[PDB]
Design a protein around this ligand. Structure first.
Ligand SMILES: [K+]
Ligand SMILES: [K+]
Ligand SMILES: [Mg+2]
Ligand SMILES: [Mg+2]
Ligand SMILES: [Mg+2]
Ligand SMILES: [Mg+2]
Ligand SMILES: [Mg+2]
Ligand SMILES: [Mg+2]
Ligand SMILES: [Mg+2]
Ligand SMILES: [Mg+2]
Ligand SMILES: [Mg+2]
Ligand SMILES: [Mg+2]
Ligand SMILES: [Mg+2]
Ligand SMILES: [Mg+2]
Ligand SMILES: [Mg+2]
Ligand SMILES: [Mg+2]
Ligand SMILES: [Mg+2]
Ligand code: NA
Ligand code: NA
Ligand code: NA
Lengths: 144, 71, 101, 183, 82, 66, 152, 134
RNA sequence: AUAGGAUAGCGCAUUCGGUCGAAUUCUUCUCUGCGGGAUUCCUUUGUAAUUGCACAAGGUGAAAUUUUGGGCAACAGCAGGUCUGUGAUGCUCCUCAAUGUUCUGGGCGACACGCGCACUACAAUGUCAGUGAGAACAAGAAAAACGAUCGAACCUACUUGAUCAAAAGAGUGGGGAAACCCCGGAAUCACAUAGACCCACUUGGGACCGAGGAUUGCAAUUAUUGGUCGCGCAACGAGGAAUGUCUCGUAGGCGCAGCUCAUCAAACUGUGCCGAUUACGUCCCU
């Protein structure tokens, strides 16, 4: 009988919310919405999600099973939310089950590469105003 | 720009004149003191008053400040 | 049996006062309480042109109406539930009683 | 176990530098896996100089109504362009891109009504090189059998060698020649 | 009216089918190119891109050229080393 | 053919429309050269800043002060 | 080395392999067996009224049946209306702005009928369509073949 | 398709008094004749047993005759009535498919029919104006 | 693999919202009524001060300067618009074959032409045919009638039509709306799909028109609106002089809902999605 080691994190980008469940398992197994990492398309978005592993190194994910459920947003914002949840999930796991010297070298490595790997981007859609066709574009003016 | 209006400056000068002994060079403790010695709706105004109140205290250490009368 | 109280109003202050009053009275009865759930606030939106004649810049007025809803579940008989919700409710607050199954 | 990024897991950033003494602090050689990031680059004046150079090239392909906002499409086009550049030159396509950006914009211009010769700031030299190379490739591939990744690769390779066959080099010479007249 | 000139061009004639002369050049001249693309082969052999791309797939299947960059809409080939 | 100069002081936005910046640039030359530590005033088109670098081509013309 | 099991991991289920590879392999299996029912209307009709041309793949019905079987696996209890959203497209309306149209439920109803005859799909309790035990077995067994690089 | 060009290849193929281009694919070369669209041409190839990936210049004389006879009488080759461009002729009541010059001839008859009865749609056609309420 | 590259894993192997199986525990994600949080707060051998009020870089931070976007917004005015919103109104006009009010038909849509604002395009950064993964704001049914306190109007899922096109047409169930729709399978987008096309007014474009059929309505002719097959041999290959809007989740692109609505969005009001270039200035033009 062994204790269950598990943490839960979230990553956000626009309206996309990703929830990652990081569990200590027999082997590393990361899936996004039930899809394995190598089955995620396009390859450009797969590389963005894989940054949460390659930046610190795959040795820190050695026996972690990560399940990421992403809802809302679109094709790209879901990928950015998913990689933030995975990167934040590793930090939370090391914060709960490891010491502080680790999870600090990992945290500095993540923030040296991209702040948005751990910190949510606050940007959101600006509301449309009447007399405008979008947030800023005003109606076409004619003079004669 | 960040200019303190006469509403904030007048209130800050009143706060220092009456609670000089309880004020400090730290915004966060001064904000706590100002919260229960002033009545106002705006949390933003209280925060602005705490910012200028701390500014006056730093000026008072270096010398006299015009408009402030410590008896 | 489970009795559900639905509290709906236009005024947020009134809907919170009535909900807290029901919670306090139910606590005095030592009945099982399923905490007051804050249902999503619904906004009714009507956007109309300001002018009454269609002259000038097409300026608009956005009118909004917010509806607040709360639910409380009571594990009490209808007789006990009835006398719990028997105080002077604030005006503009609608309390409905239903029996769950 | 962590390793340095390689663009498209193929091209290494090791030793990436510009031969131009200027533009050294305005051409970013930071290693990246793909030319896609969601950074808030246009928030301060000179922050765009820190954006990786290939991503800046990708942003230059998102033009006209039918190309606006297609950053994944631009990333795919660049992936094929770099392979064609490697076959054409037998060098690292990242270095070829840096060389093309290094010399793809005039160092002297004429402004203002009598025109007067002025010098070009390093930020504008990098901006103009990317703008001109992408504009030339886009127009070269418009009603053409050749696809853009071939047209873009030809434009970059020619500009990296300073050849007049590139649109960017031709425009640079004409501007600098006119600036010499307006001295 | 007529605010633009248009700059009319010359309509190229590209064969939609291979003949013996063009097929032989594809199997002999093409595998010597450093950069191989359906657009490039179409220009040298005066053939349509559709049949040029089909010819390149036959060469790649025969291990006469190698696939460098592949996508749904883009294929890049190069000559076999040695 | 092109001498590299370093911007050491931004003097202001000159001309109409403010699209040209006048700066003082120090010529970066090896010690012992005649142009060592030679400062000149030039007009710059585009976003520029202190400690930026310029390719000056010719280094004889000096921009009029404004 | 390309098909070797990663490590300590064995077998494969659906959602573990390429979605297109499974659909292409399932369509090939349906055609090779020759037991699936193919309506004659599939040789003349369009997959939806939102399209402007008929399908260019002669085996488009087998692919559609395979894709529908995968869709039922992922969303048990789905009906023809739910499948219609998945196979919709943007219809061209000429000089008017274009709009999204759900796919025609006719071919989808036929596709579920063909899969029901094969025993892979049964009507779910309280509405919808669901995979049978054989249908679930067929999907996961074929996914392993895709991972093994068999492809029929 | 890597098939060598035959000696009998034709760049212009004559079919139902229309100059069909031989360099085109078979379904997209059959849509050059009047009355045959993209949807109809694919069915014609299917009913004639002609691979749609071929070029029309490679078609044999017997292949063209099979194509020509299918276009003339599509219903005989199990082409449904709802697929035809004249399903219940207002003059004869018979389902047919107009092709080649008969498409223009029937259109002239349709215009003349409405003009003779002095219908509103016929009057608009004679005056050279729009007839669909535009 | 038909030719099969690149791309994490190397005490207990993964998967199944129909397995509509149970149980137990819980609040990371969702809901929200009051709170907290940011202010020039901290630091410069910065600017300036030579008091001050402040400013510029960086730090801290979810957010760093009116935090972002809106709403509100003084005093004086214009003979600006509305007497076509009202049972808001002075004067004036008509008032029984009426300028009142109903009913029938027609018109408000009529085209040598000119102008404003949109929509769709001129294609390969493409069009077709497939396949994948995937938003948000929102809407939904009735009387002091009519039928036996509800049930029928409204929106929908599923099934059926189907032993053979679409659009339909039916049956059953649910939803008063965080409960059903709904795990809201939107479209830009993605695909190593080994797919078709190959630079041409062409499989670009889809105006114009022909024939069948269905649907809304008391009524469709002057096509109400969908769907099918023809027509595409209509202009259009990037647009002269001029000219509009816009600084970050912005422009542009992309769809969706609401609103008008029995039927009909190229409009508007909102919503989310993909996401840039340039500037960080000046008073040359207005
Ligand atoms: K005034
Ligand atoms: K001015
Ligand atoms: Mg005027
Ligand atoms: Mg289109
Ligand atoms: Mg459109
Ligand atoms: Mg006034
Ligand atoms: Mg007036
Ligand atoms: Mg009046
Ligand atoms: Mg009125
Ligand atoms: Mg009157
Ligand atoms: Mg009368
Ligand atoms: Mg009108
Ligand atoms: Mg006008
Ligand atoms: Mg595209
Ligand atoms: Mg054209
Ligand atoms: Mg203007
Ligand atoms: Mg309107
Ligand atoms: Na307007
Ligand atoms: Na106002
Ligand atoms: Na049509």
């Amino acid at each position: 009988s062994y204790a269950l080691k598990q943490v839960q994190t979230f990553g956000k980008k626009k309206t996309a919310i990703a929830v990652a469940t990081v569990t200590k398992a027999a082997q590393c197994n990361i899936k996004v919405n039930g899809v394995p990492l190598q089955q995620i398309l396009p390859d450009t978005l797969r590389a963005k999600i894989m940054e949460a592993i390659t930046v610190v190194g795959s040795k820190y994910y050695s026996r972690l099973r990560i399940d990421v459920a992403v809802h809302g947003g679109g094709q790209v914002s879901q990928a950015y939310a998913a990689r933030q949840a995975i990167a934040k999930g590793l930090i939370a796991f090391f914060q709960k089950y490891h010491n502080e010297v680790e999870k600090a070298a990992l945290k500095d490595k993540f923030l040296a590469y991209d702040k948005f790997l751990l910190i949510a981007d606050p940007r959101r859609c600006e509301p449309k105003k009447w007399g405008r066709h979008s947030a800023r574009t005003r109606f076409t003016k004619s003079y004669r | 720009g960040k200019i303190r209006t006469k509403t904030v400056k007048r209130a800050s000068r009143q706060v220092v004149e009456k609670y000089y002994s309880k004020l400090n060079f730290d915004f966060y403790q001064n904000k706590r003191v100002i919260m229960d010695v002033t009545i106002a709706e705006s949390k933003k105004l209280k925060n602005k008053i705490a910012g200028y109140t701390t500014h006056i205290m730093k000026r008072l250490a270096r010398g006299p400040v015009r408009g402030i009368s410590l008896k | 049996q489970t009795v559900r109280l639905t509290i709906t109003s236009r005024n947020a202050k009134a809907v919170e006062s009535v909900t807290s009053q029901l919670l306090t009275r139910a606590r005095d009865e030592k009945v099982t309480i399923h905490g007051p759930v804050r249902l999503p606030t619904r906004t009714l939106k009507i956007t109309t042109r300001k002018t009454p004649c269609g002259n000038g810049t097409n300026t608009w007025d956005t009118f909004e109406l917010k509806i607040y809803k709360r639910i409380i579940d009571l594990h009490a008989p209808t007789e006990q539930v009835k006398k719990i919700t028997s105080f002077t409710m604030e005006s503009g607050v609608d309390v409905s009683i239903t029996i769950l199954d | 176990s962590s390793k340095t990024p390689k663009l498209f897991n193929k091209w290494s950033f090791e030793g990436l530098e510009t031969s131009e003494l200027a533009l050294r602090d305005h051409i970013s050689t930071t290693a990246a896996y793909v030319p896609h990031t969601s950074g808030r680059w246009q928030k301060r004046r000179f922050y765009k100089a820190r954006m990786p150079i290939v991503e800046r090239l990708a942003n230059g392909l998102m033009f006209k109504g039918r190309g606006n906002g297609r950053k994944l499409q631009a990333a795919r086009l660049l992936k094929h362009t770099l392979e064609i550049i490697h076959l054409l030159t037998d060098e690292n396509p990242l270095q070829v891109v840096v060389d093309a950006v290094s010399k793809g914009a005039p160092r002297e211009d004429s402004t203002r009504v009598r025109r007067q010769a002025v010098d070009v700031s390093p930020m504008r030299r990098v901006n103009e090189a990317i703008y001109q190379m992408c504009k030339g490739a886009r127009e070269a591939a418009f009603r053409n059998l050749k696809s853009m990744p071939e047209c873009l690769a030809d434009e970059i390779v020619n500009a990296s060698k300073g050849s007049s066959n590139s649109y960017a080099i031709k425009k640079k010479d004409e501007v600098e020649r006119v600036a010499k007249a307006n001295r | 009216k007529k605010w633009s000139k248009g700059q009319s061009r010359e309509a190229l004639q590209n064969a939609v089918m291979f003949d013996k002369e063009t097929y032989d050049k594809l199997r002999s001249e093409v595998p010597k190119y450093k950069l191989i693309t359906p657009s490039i082969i179409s220009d040298r052999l005066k053939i349509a891109v559709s049949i040029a791309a089909a010819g390149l797939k036959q060469l790649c299947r025969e291990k006469l050229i190698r696939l460098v960059s592949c996508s749904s809409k883009t294929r890049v080939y190069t000559r076999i080393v040695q | 053919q092109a001498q590299v100069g370093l911007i050491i002081k931004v003097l202001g936005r000159t001309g109409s429309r403010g699209n040209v910046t006048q700066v003082r640039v120090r010529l970066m030359a090896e010690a012992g050269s005649p142009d060592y530590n030679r400062t000149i005033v030039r007009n710059v088109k585009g976003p520029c800043k202190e400690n930026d670098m310029l390719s000056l081509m010719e280094t004889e013309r000096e921009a009029r002060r404004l | 080395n390309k098909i070797h099991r990663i490590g300590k991991r064995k077998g494969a289920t659906l959602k573990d392999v390429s979605a297109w590879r499974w659909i292409k392999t399932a369509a090939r299996h349906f055609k090779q067996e020759g037991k699936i029912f193919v309506p004659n209307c599939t040789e003349i009709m369009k997959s939806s009224h939102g399209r402007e041309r008929a399908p260019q793949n002669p085996d488009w019905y087998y692919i559609r049946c395979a894709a529908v079987l995968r869709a039922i696996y992922l969303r048990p209890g789905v009906g023809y209306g739910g499948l219609s959203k998945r196979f919709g497209n943007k219809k061209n309306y000429g000089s008017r702005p274009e709009h999204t149209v759900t796919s025609s439920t006719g071919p989808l109803h036929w596709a579920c009928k063909s899969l029901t005859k094969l025993g892979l799909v049964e009507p779910g309790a309280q509405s919808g369509q669901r995979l049978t035990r054989k249908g679930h077995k067929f999907a996961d067994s074929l996914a392993f073949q895709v991972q093994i690089r068999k492809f029929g | 398709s890597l098939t060598l060009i035959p000696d009998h290849f034709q760049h212009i193929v004559r079919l139902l008094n229309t100059n069909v281009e031989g360099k085109r694919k078979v379904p997209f070369a059959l849509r050059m004749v009047k009355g045959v669209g993209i949807r109809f041409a694919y069915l014609v190839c299917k009913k004639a047993g002609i691979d749609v990936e071929r070029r029309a210049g490679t078609l044999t004389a017997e292949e063209l005759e099979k194509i020509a006879e299918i276009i003339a009488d599509p219903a005989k080759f199990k082409i449904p009535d709802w697929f035809l461009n004249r399903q219940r002729d207002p003059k004869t009541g018979k389902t047919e498919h107009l092709s080649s010059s008969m498409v223009d001839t029937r259109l002239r008859d349709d215009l003349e029919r409405l003009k003779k009865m002095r219908a509103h749609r016929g009057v608009r056609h004679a005056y050279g104006l729009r007839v669909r309420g535009q």
